[PDB]
Design an enzyme around this catalytic site. Structure first.
Site, mmCIF file in Angstrom:
data_model
loop_
_atom_site.group_PDB
_atom_site.id
_atom_site.type_symbol
_atom_site.label_atom_id
_atom_site.label_comp_id
_atom_site.label_asym_id
_atom_site.label_seq_id
_atom_site.Cartn_x
_atom_site.Cartn_y
_atom_site.Cartn_z
ATOM 1 N N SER A 118 1.320 -1.162 0.106
ATOM 2 C CA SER A 118 0.110 -0.131 -0.068
ATOM 3 C C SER A 118 1.474 1.124 -0.492
ATOM 4 O O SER A 118 1.279 1.166 1.304
ATOM 5 N N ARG A 119 1.054 1.892 -0.851
ATOM 6 C CA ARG A 119 1.590 2.865 -1.174
ATOM 7 C C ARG A 119 1.889 4.179 -0.693
ATOM 8 O O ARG A 119 2.465 4.946 0.297
ATOM 9 N N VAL A 120 0.587 3.990 0.613
ATOM 10 C CA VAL A 120 0.106 4.925 1.385
ATOM 11 C C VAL A 120 0.456 3.844 3.092
ATOM 12 O O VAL A 120 1.399 4.200 2.725
#
Lengths: 264, 255, 131, 156, 161
Positions: B117-119
């Site tokens: 999750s690049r978040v």
């Protein structure tokens, strides 16, 4: 051999490689263990040799070697295998005993016939005096004793070196009875035997441990090289990979362009 | 519409891959130069253009959202594939699933290592966050040491723990089909493990525990569960309370 | 002085240590090993090593078996199969073991059986010596 | 590549110079498991050739099989007979290395040309392991086997 | 990124811009609107985005994915063009953040597609190189400043030659 094939390679090679290292560590850990454990032993076994160290024996006449059960370690086996046989011509009562089996597995060719007994497990279970006694014990009961016995084992020296070493095992009280050995004791061909005995076990233990120590570092070493080896090869494939990888595409693109310049 | 109606919608695009094919086909029929693997050039663009439309707006729009779950389905041992490439560049992390774990029974079966999750944290609860940071960590090293899953006996205990622990955690991330949960529970069960109460327990019993425990807390500590549901973090109170519950429960469970 | 090497597989207790004398339970019986040594070989019985370390201090052990190696040298080598300081043995247990030993003997009825049992008796008893 | 692929059909003797081999330095650089000749036959060129070869082709073929496992393993925990044979195969390889009279400038080495018999002999001997108590490199860039012998001395 | 790659970048942007009076260009190449959005806020946040004075050290150019590739394809050139302004005109030693130029490249390839061109290998746009040469050769140091590039590059398929 499409990328696939290659992947079969690669995949497994990583694994291997990985494994080698894992196994390396594993090995190294064992190896470490052997090292420590070698300490009291050194003393003890050096001790074993005491008498003998203080006393020459002879015979006009138990050639036995000491190896590990398993390979996938150095040339331990090779050495012993070699050097038992290397001897073996010279002497009367030619009979051989092999402890470990990475000697049974190489020194077997006609040692299928000249072994007296052979012993299985060594390493993969750290050696013990207890054990030493065992193999020692039955060893006695047997009409083979000295043809002048010798014990061939891997004397560890350092992780960089071991020397398959050998000593002779005077398996005769009798000439020890004879000689000036006569008064190195000044107390019975009885207890003699029960030392001859004991020292055979002590040494056996000792030998066993050296052998295994040597082995464990060799295996450790062995795992080192291999995994490096692995590494380069991966690299090489990786080229072959992309290249072909693209090659596909290319060929295919070709096929597209062509087939798109030549559809119905 | 929802997004602009402040609301948060979830679209599952299952799947752009097949779309792409269709489109490609379409393109080609259009006698157009397509692209890589005969697939069009703008099949990314198309979709970029699509997918950028899945978003979280500012406040002006009621802050709304359209949360997108595009699917691209593993190319039977490949994902180097063009469209994946694209998508990889597009999505805001990607969930790599691998079967094998599934096949191990390890369900879910994710290739977590690749999953991203690049978040991350904005999409989190402190509750979770507080532990999850660590969790991630626990897995990380665990993965590193899972490397040497063969044995590790022959190596140090710490790491042997990590392996056990790790394996345990695995059980915690495992879930059945038609078995989704809610958050407090999730953290709850993680807490136990993360407090390493279960190392002694074997994986089989983790699950076992978890249910039982779950149903237990559901019963008793329903009290607590109301609170935790509330709390958004794990509370000190809750920790202790949890712990005590757990320890006791655990004790019973294991017993 | 005598350089006493007292070791077991497990450890070295004394290592060529200038111990004045050590009293051992060779299978010869007892024996008072002094500073230099006879060329003599001795067998160890279950009894004690009392290691009169040239300093008055003497350590005790019970040794089961092994060898003392009695060099022309002042080097004495006790290689005890196991010689342990009694420290790690337990009297209560000793009794229990001895009991058993004695129990067993009674059904020991091959020479060997008797003998081993007898080892136990003898042994266990010999632990009781100093336990 | 289709082109050569086709070509083969038309061949009767194929000469594959093998870069791998070339990398092994060897000039000669051929690989005869590749370089084959339709006219290489127990027929056309004697079976001796063939067989002496078949053993060779074999041994090599096996070896070829081995190098890769060995690549990892070395031949270390892998059977000595094999070790021998491998080495032999190789020796035979080395023995095939042959100086270039033309390219003495290039080689340094001074050309060799070996009539058949000494050829046969050579392999038969090496094959006999008779030779083997010897260095691998002795076989390198030889002329007839003698020259390897000569060289052996010159080595050891 | 999210490491503070971008941050590092920001810090850098700062540092040069500061230390030399230099400046930066941010060229959001095939930009993820999302990230640029996020980022935007970060600069704002960082305050490097100055908004009172828009005397941020950077002019931001975003050329998002969602834009037609044809459009996307050019945005670097644009950036370049500005930077020349700044360089020559504004004397500046510009930092050119190109993010992600690979995506440019990619866009080029897409572009090619539509352009029906026979393109470079793997289908990669043909003129990838030529485009690059003129462009890359545009990027330089004049003798009036320099347009110095910081290029975020994604190594496609982590494959390099």
């Amino acid at each position: 051999a499409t990328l696939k094939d290659i992947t079969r390679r690669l995949k497994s090679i990583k694994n291997i490689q990985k494994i080698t290292k894992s196994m390396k560590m594993v090995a190294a850990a064992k190896y470490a263990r052997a090292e420590r454990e070698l300490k009291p032993a050194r003393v003890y076994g050096v001790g074993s040799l005491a008498l003998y160290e203080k006393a020459d024996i002879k015979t006009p006449e138990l050639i036995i070697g000491v190896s590990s059960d398993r390979g996938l370690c150095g040339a331990i086996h090779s050495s012993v295998a070699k050097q038992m046989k290397s001897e073996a011509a010279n002497l009367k009562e030619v009979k051989i005993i092999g402890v470990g089996d990475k000697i049974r597995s190489i020194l077997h060719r006609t040692h299928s016939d000249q072994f007296l007994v052979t012993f299985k497990e060594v390493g993969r279970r750290p050696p013990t005096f207890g054990d030493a006694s065992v193999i020692a014990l039955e060893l006695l009961n047997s009409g083979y004793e000295f043809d002048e016995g010798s014990i061939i084992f891997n004397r560890f020296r350092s992780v960089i070196s071991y020397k398959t070493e050998e000593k002779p095992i005077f398996s005769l009280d009798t000439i020890s009875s004879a000689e000036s050995m006569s008064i190195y004791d000044d107390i019975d061909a009885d207890v003699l035997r029960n030392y001859q005995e004991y020292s055979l076990a002590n040494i056996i233990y000792y030998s066993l441990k050296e052998s295994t120590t040597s082995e464990q570092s060799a295996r450790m070493t062995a795992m080192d090289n291999a995994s490096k080896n692995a590494s380069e090869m991966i690299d090489k494939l990786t080229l072959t990979f992309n290249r072909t990888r693209q090659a596909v595409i290319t060929k295919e693109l070709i096929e597209i362009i062509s087939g798109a310049a030549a559809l119905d | 519409y929802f997004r602009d109606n402040g609301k948060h919608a979830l679209i599952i695009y299952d799947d752009l891959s097949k779309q792409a094919v269709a489109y490609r086909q379409m393109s080609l029929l259009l006698r157009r130069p397509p692209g890589r693997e005969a697939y069009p050039g703008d099949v990314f663009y198309l979709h970029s253009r699509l997918l950028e439309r899945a978003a979280k707006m500012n406040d002006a729009f009621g802050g709304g959202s359209l949360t997108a779950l595009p699917v691209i389905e593993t190319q039977a041992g490949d994902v180097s594939a063009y469209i994946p490439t694209n998508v990889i560049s597009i999505t805001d992390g990607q969930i790599f699933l691998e079967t094998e774990l599934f096949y191990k029974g390890i369900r879910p079966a994710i290739n977590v290592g690749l999953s991203v999750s690049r978040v991350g944290s904005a999409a989190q609860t402190r509750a979770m966050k507080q532990v999850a940071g660590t969790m991630k960590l626990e897995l990380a090293q665990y993965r590193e040491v899972a490397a040497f899953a063969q044995f590790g006996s022959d190596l140090d205990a710490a790491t042997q723990q990590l392996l056990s622990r790790g394996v345990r955690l695995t059980e915690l991330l495992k879930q059945g089909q038609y078995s989704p949960m809610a958050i407090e529970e999730q953290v709850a069960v993680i807490y136990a493990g993360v407090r390493g109460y279960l190392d002694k327990l074997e994986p089989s019993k983790i699950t076992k525990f978890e249910n039982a425990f779950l149903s237990h807390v559901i019963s008793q500590h329903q009290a607590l569960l109301g609170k935790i549901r509330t709390d958004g973090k794990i509370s000190e109170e809750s920790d202790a309370k949890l712990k005590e519950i757990v320890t006791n429960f655990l004790a019973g469970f294991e017993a | 002085q005598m350089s006493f090497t007292f070791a077991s597989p497990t450890q070295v207790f004394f290592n060529s240590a200038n111990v004045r004398q050590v009293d051992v339970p060779t299978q010869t019986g007892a024996f008072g090993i002094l500073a230099a040594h006879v060329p003599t070989l001795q067998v160890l019985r279950p009894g004690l090593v009392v290691v009169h370390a040239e300093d008055g201090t003497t350590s005790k052990y019970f040794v089961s078996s092994g060898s003392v190696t009695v060099n022309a040298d002042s080097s004495v080598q006790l290689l005890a199969e196991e010689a342990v300081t009694l420290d790690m043995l337990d009297l209560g247990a000793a009794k229990a073991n001895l009991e058993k030993a004695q129990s067993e003997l009674l059904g020991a009825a091959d020479e060997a059986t008797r003998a081993e049992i007898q080892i136990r008796i003898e042994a266990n008893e010999a632990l009781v010596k100093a336990l | 590549d289709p082109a050569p692929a086709t070509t083969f059909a038309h061949l009767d003797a194929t000469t594959v110079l093998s870069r791998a081999i070339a990398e092994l330095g060897i000039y000669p650089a051929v690989d005869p498991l590749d370089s084959t000749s339709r006219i290489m036959d127990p027929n056309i060129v004697g079976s001796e050739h063939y067989d002496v070869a078949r053993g060779v082709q074999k041994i090599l073929q096996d070896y070829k099989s081995l190098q890769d496992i060995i690549a990892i393993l070395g031949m270390d925990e892998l059977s000595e007979e094999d070790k021998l044979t491998v080495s032999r195969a190789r020796k035979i390889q080395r023995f095939l290395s042959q100086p270039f009279q033309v390219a003495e400038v290039f080689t340094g080495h001074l050309g060799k040309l070996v009539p058949l018999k000494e050829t046969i002999k050579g392999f038969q001997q090496i094959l006999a392991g008779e030779y083997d108590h010897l260095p691998e490199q002795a076989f390198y860039m030889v002329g007839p086997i003698e020259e390897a012998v000569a060289k052996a001395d010159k080595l050891a | 990124a999210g490491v503070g790659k971008t941050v590092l970048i920001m810090e850098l942007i700062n540092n040069v811009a500061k230390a030399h009076g230099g400046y930066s260009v941010f060229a959001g190449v095939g930009e993820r609107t999302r990230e640029g959005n996020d980022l935007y806020h970060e600069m704002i946040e960082s305050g490097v985005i100055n908004l009172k004075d828009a005397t941020s050290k950077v002019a931001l150019v975003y050329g998002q994915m969602n834009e037609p590739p044809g459009a996307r394809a050019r945005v670097a050139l644009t950036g370049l063009t500005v930077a020349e302004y700044f360089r020559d005109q504004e004397g500046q030693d510009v930092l050119l953040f190109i993010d992600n130029i690979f995506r440019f490249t990619q866009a080029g390839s897409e572009v090619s597609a539509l352009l029906g061109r026979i393109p470079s290998a793997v289908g990669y746009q043909p003129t990838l190189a030529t485009d690059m040469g003129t462009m890359q050769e545009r990027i330089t140091t004049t003798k009036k400043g320099s347009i110095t590039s910081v290029q975020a590059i994604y190594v496609p398929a982590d494959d390099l030659t």
